[PDB]
Design a protein around this ligand. Structure first.
Ligand SMILES: *[C@H]1O[C@H](CO)[C@@H](O)[C@H](O)[C@H]1F
Ligand SMILES: [Zn+2]
Length: 478
């Protein structure tokens, strides 16, 4: 049976977390508010259970238990994020550096290393400073670049002596599409007719502006890291990107081209600038002047601006051709001219998890990795997120809640799929499971549980290993 020993020597296995989802202590230790603090408190109706990340999984206090839990399993590495507003409470240098915030992450990093766990740090996992949102609309302004760069530099200076793996942005696709196209995530911006029924926004322009600025802030940060830090600290810097696998709705060329446009808009949006120096052709053609243009100098900067790419995979969609709109309802969601579904002829592409967007389709994992291999020059890849969820069920006894056989099944099949892709030449160096603990699942709150370990929110955030924790322990032997 598949184990760590099936994988190449030195292959890294870990779990993944994020600051807002895990930490809590939201107004503690000098932490400033982020856009997710604001979104959750000011728009509780946008969250399934009207909840927030004030306490979350309380990892701000309980991080030592987290490290113990992952060490028990035999994890090599931990993917976590730093809260921007823990370090810079109002987003900028001039607003002051929070020493207490630096202390917490030093304590976390030191605890991890004392137990032989390598820290992988995401700089931006969506908890953008509210003060910069108020000041200049955050990522909608080119002002965000320098503020992010200043924030990143503090992190390199304070932590880079021990941290050798950096990720700038987590899934800019999700941040921009849900935050500015549908308006379902913070900062909750969209066109009036879009899903979020937002008071402010433009779903056909703002997603592209926000993500253009992220690509620029990323490339600037990579450059800065390589120029001032990489020589003496000898770490690696990358970016985390998400993609579904897209199955053509039918075998027609039209639906095959729709599947190609689907991946271009979700994934190529960031990959093409990183590999080829410009946005995908389909994006430039279809979006036109609503898509920002890189200057020759900016194109030079973004191209090759990485040591690795973090790759996230969860599910697959069917892609069906959409006729032009062709009109006054322009939105990133429809701009691809590809209609995305998880069901065809009343049959779901795979078994549906607790998240309605999550269909279990392990075959697409291999398919995506081989697509990246053949179409992007087979770059160094870490799987930075892969996982599945069950419903939070208050009626179930604890012992039945810990029996997550569906999670075991999910990981077994995906790791096999990953292994076959590696054996067929995919340049994959590591794998991170989402998630170590149950946590705040954004617009779903605490209604769904992604964790390998259970968190009892009603009993002081006590952690209990699920059956999958024991499974990973066996898997990770040696
Ligand atoms: C990756 O996906 C998971 C599951 O939806 C989120 O909880 C993480 O924050 C995201 F980075
Ligand atoms: Zn506590």
């Amino acid at each position: 049976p598949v184990s760590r020993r099936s994988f190449p020597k030195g292959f890294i296995f870990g779990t993944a977390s994020s600051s807002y989802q895990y930490e809590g202590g939201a107004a503690e230790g000098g932490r400033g508010p982020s856009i997710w603090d604001t979104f959750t408190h000011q728009h509780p109706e946008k969250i399934a259970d009207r909840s927030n990340g004030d306490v979350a999984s309380d990892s701000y206090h309980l991080y030592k238990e987290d490290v113990r839990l992952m060490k028990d399993m035999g994890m090599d590495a931990y993917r976590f994020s730093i809260s921007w507003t823990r370090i810079l409470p109002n987003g900028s240098l001039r607003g002051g550096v929070n020493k207490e915030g630096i202390k917490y992450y030093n304590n976390l990093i030191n605890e991890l290393l004392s137990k032989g766990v390598q820290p992988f740090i995401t700089l931006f996992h969506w908890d953008s400073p509210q003060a910069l949102e108020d000041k200049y609309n955050g990522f909608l302004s080119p002002n965000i670049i320098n503020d992010f760069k200043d924030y990143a530099e503090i992190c390199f200076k304070e932590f880079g002596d021990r941290v050798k793996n950096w990720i700038t942005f987590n899934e800019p696709w999700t941040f921009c599409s849900n935050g500015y196209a549908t308006g379902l995530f913070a900062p909750g911006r969209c066109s009036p007719w879009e899903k979020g029924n937002c008071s402010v926004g433009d779903s056909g322009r703002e997603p592209y502006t926000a993500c253009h600025h992220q690509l620029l802030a990323h490339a600037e940060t990579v450059r800065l890291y390589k120029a001032k830090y990489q020589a003496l600290q000898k770490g690696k810097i990358g970016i985390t990107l998400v993609s579904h696998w897209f199955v053509p709705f039918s075998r027609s060329k039209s639906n095959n081209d729709a599947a190609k446009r689907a991946i271009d808009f979700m994934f190529g949006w960031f990959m093409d600038p990183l590999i080829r120096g410009d946005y995908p052709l389909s994006m430039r053609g279809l979006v036109g002047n609503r898509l920002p243009q890189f200057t020759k100098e900016q194109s030079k900067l973004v191209k090759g601006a990485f040591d690795f790419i973090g790759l996230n995979y969860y599910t697959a969609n069917y892609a069906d051709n959409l006729p032009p709109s062709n009109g006054l309802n322009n939105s990133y969601t429809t701009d691809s001219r590809a209609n995305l579904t998880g069901v065809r002829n009343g049959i779901p592409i795979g078994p549906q998890a607790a998240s309605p967007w999550l269909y279990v389709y392990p075959q697409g994992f291999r398919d995506l990795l081989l697509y990246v291999k053949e179409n992007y020059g087979n770059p160094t890849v870490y799987i930075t997120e892969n996982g599945v969820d069950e419903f939070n069920n208050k009626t179930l006894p604890l012992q039945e809640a810990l029996k997550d056989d569906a999670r075991i099944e999910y990981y077994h099949k995906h790791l096999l799929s990953l292994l076959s892709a590696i054996r067929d030449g995919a340049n994959v160096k590591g794998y991170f499971a989402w998630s170590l603990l149950d946590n705040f699942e954004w617009s779903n709150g605490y209604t769904v549980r992604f964790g390998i370990n259970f968190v009892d929110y009603n009993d002081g955030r006590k952690r209990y290993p699920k059956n999958s924790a024991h499974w990973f322990k066996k898997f990770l032997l040696k």
